[PDB]
Each structure stands twice: as structure tokens, then as C-alpha cells.
Design a protein around this ligand. Structure first.
Ligand SMILES: Cc1ccc2c(c1)c1c(n2Cc2ccccc2)[C@H](CC(=O)O)CCC1
Length: 133
């Protein structure tokens, strides 16, 4: 029943500062424009200890499956090859991506009827808000 409150199908309803976040990550102009337009659906499911997060959009479809605390390979929508670890900290999913000596942290939390995604690259934070589909 870990992560029950995250399970479901979610649709993006707002984004703030995501272009600046992508710039800080190192994403180039064309990918930032196209990625920034997308309105993804996020599909989260749990089967035993395995959590799956899918992102479906006009830009890219991505999928990760993982066990909390257990590092995995992830190819991000912007085609970074990262090493990811996702843990639960006080009810927040905390996702750290490492690549090329860099790091970014993505937090996913339930707040009211929303799922809030906060991503941070050094001093730059972006907030993306999802509602149930
Ligand atoms: C650098 C970079 C590029 C693409 C990126 C990200 C970082 C991050 C996301 N996406 C997917 C995405 C997929 C489609 C469109 C935009 C973004 C997720 C956004 C989310 O799930 O809303 C999680 C936070 C960090």
C-alpha cells in the first residue's frame, strides 16, 4: 500500500519555470521548445515492490520501473543516460538522477487532489501540477 495515493492516471494542468530548469540541466533550444509544449499524462502503478511511472505525450513516451532504494538506468525524455535512485521520504517520492558529474532531484507528492512534481537543478526549481485524468 506503498504509494497507494500516487497510483492512477494523471494529466498535467500547470507548469512553472520548466524552461529555466531545462536550461540549467543543459537541454538545447529545440528540445526545450517542444518538450515545454507537451501536456503529458502520467500513469503510476504498483505491482508488489515494483513501481512503474509512465509518461505519455506528443513529445515522448517514457517508462521507468523500479524498486525503492535500488539504483537503475534511466534514459530521460531529453536523451540523458542517467543513474537514478528513488526513495520514499516522509510520503514524498524522491528521485535523484546522476550523469556526467551532475545531479538533479525530482520530488513527487500528493497535495489535496493534485500530484505535484518539483524538480531542482542547482538553484533552479520548477513546479508541475497534475490532476486526475
Ligand atoms: C530535462 C528534462 C526533460 C524532460 C523531463 C524532465 C527533465 C523531467 C521530466 N521530464 C519529462 C517530460 C516529458 C514530456 C514533456 C516535458 C517533460 C518529468 C516531468 C513530468 O513528468 O511532468 C519529471 C521532472 C523532470
Amino acid at each position: 500500500h506503498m504509494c497507494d495515493a500516487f497510483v492512477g492516471t494523471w494529466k498535467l494542468v500547470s507548469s512553472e519555470n520548466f524552461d529555466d530548469y531545462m536550461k540549467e540541466v543543459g537541454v538545447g533550444f529545440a528540445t526545450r521548445k517542444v518538450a515545454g509544449m507537451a501536456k503529458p499524462n502520467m500513469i503510476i502503478s504498483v505491482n508488489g515492490d515494483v513501481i512503474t511511472i509512465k509518461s505519455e505525450s506528443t513529445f515522448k513516451n517514457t517508462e521507468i520501473s523500479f524498486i525503492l532504494g535500488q539504483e537503475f538506468d534511466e534514459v530521460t525524455a531529453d536523451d540523458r543516460k542517467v543513474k537514478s535512485t528513488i526513495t520514499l521520504d516522509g510520503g514524498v517520492l524522491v528521485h535523484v538522477q546522476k550523469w556526467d558529474g551532475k545531479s538533479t532531484t525530482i520530488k513527487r507528492k500528493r497535495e489535496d487532489d493534485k500530484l505535484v512534481v518539483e524538480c531542482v537543478m542547482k538553484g533552479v526549481t520548477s513546479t508541475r501540477v497534475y490532476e486526475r485524468a
